[PDB]
């Protein structure tokens, strides 16, 4: 048998995902999500593909910034794990809730 | 006067038009595949389903007796039905497709039918003796006409702008005026509707302006008159063209539906301001709007969906207590210590 101790196959894939820059979200579920929550404001809309790409890039950047600030809160509380009170704290402090 | 959402009808899809009787009990939902669905208010049920035709049923009209509808389609048959068991009494396979049917209110042998191209000619029930209503110009190809409230006259409307008035059966040319649309460019007419008390009426023009006139004013005008309107209605912000207009149960609150946005606008006859804008599903396009005569609830026909718009009596019901008025702070008054008329009951 062969196993790694936990944390090793975290730190690798951290270096890997900080090198590679493409999408990280499969685009047809995201396009169906956009069409779902745009159904409720107007029926029979018609998205260009570049608009869906722009929404994908903006939402990806927003989630990455939110997880960086959540990581700062979690290291501040003398833990390593992330719990949802950290995310609620970060959106409380930033001024969006 | 309607202010809520209050519910809707997912019963039978592909709704196209409806209207009411004098009493406001049923609801004749016109359908695309040649059907008239009849639904009830106070029992909320569907009594009779007349599977009339297969073609789009365009126009409908109830009569006063509570027995005789009249309709037409791209089947192009001036039909008739009865609500007891669905009895198609008559069947008039005719050319030149139809837009609107209209009875005389009490002489219900005479119905008034608008064809596609030429003048509306007064049909009957039994005989084919249609009474030709003479339109002079005849180059407009879309001319609409109607009765007054009591069936005492015939009002007409061309596409140029000239309005002529005839007697209800012998066609006395008594009134003649062209409408004062713009300065150099006039406009056509799309509908003219009438109340249940009084002789005020609206002129649904096609430069996005509703104009309102009275019957006594134009009978005083008569031949070669220039009747000024009682009221000029529009909406300059949203720049909206109109589809179908109607009146209130007293002829006070004009209910005109849009043609772009699925919204109702409600005015007053006297003052002339907007009072409330109604709304619904933002992703529809509205065709027909029904007003209820004795109790102000509206029906809206779009995408096969018909909606009931009441006001819920949010004030309260006050059936039990005309007495028992409220004291806010604890008011105390505890000092105190303690065959004239004969009316015919059998009337």
Swiss-Prot record, chain B:
Keywords: Chromatin regulator, Isopeptide bond, Nucleus, Phosphoprotein, Repeat, Transcription, Transcription regulation, Ubl conjugation, WD repeat
Phosphothreonine PTM positions: 240
Residues joined by cross-link Glycyl lysine isopeptide (Lys-Gly) (interchain with G-Cter in SUMO2): 117
Residues in WD repeats: 10-51, 52-91, 136-176, 184-223, 237-279, 281-319
Claim: Iron-sulfur is one of the keywords in the record: no
Outcome of mutating residue 343 to E: Significant reduction in its ability to stimulate KMT2A methyltransferase activity in association with WDR5 and ASH2L
Compartment list: Nucleus
GO cellular component: histone methyltransferase complex; MLL1 complex; MLL1/2 complex; MLL3/4 complex; nucleolus; nucleoplasm; nucleus; Set1C/COMPASS complex
Keyword Repeat found: yes
One GO MF term: transcription cis-regulatory region binding
Signal peptide annotation: none
Disulphides: none
Top-rank taxon, per record: Eukaryota
Organ and tissue specificity: Ubiquitously expressed.
GO BP, sorted A to Z: DNA damage response; response to estrogen; transcription initiation-coupled chromatin remodeling
Phosphoserine sites (modified residues): 338
Annotated spans, Interaction with WDR5: 339-347
Function of the molecule: In embryonic stem (ES) cells, plays a crucial role in the differentiation potential, particularly along the neural lineage, regulating gene induction and H3 'Lys-4' methylation at key developmental loci, including that mediated by retinoic acid. Does not affect ES cell self-renewal. Component or associated component of some histone methyltransferase complexes which regulates transcription through recruitment of those complexes to gene promoters. As part of the MLL1/MLL complex, involved in mono-, di- and trimethylation at 'Lys-4' of histone H3.
Subunit structure: Component of the SET1 complex, at least composed of the catalytic subunit (SETD1A or SETD1B), WDR5, WDR82, RBBP5, ASH2L/ASH2, CXXC1/CFP1, HCFC1 and DPY30. Core component of several methyltransferase-containing complexes including MLL1/MLL, MLL2/3 (also named ASCOM complex) and MLL4/WBP7.
Protein name as it appears in the record: Retinoblastoma-binding protein 5
Gene this protein is translated from: RBBP5
Residues of the full protein shown: 13 to 379 of 538
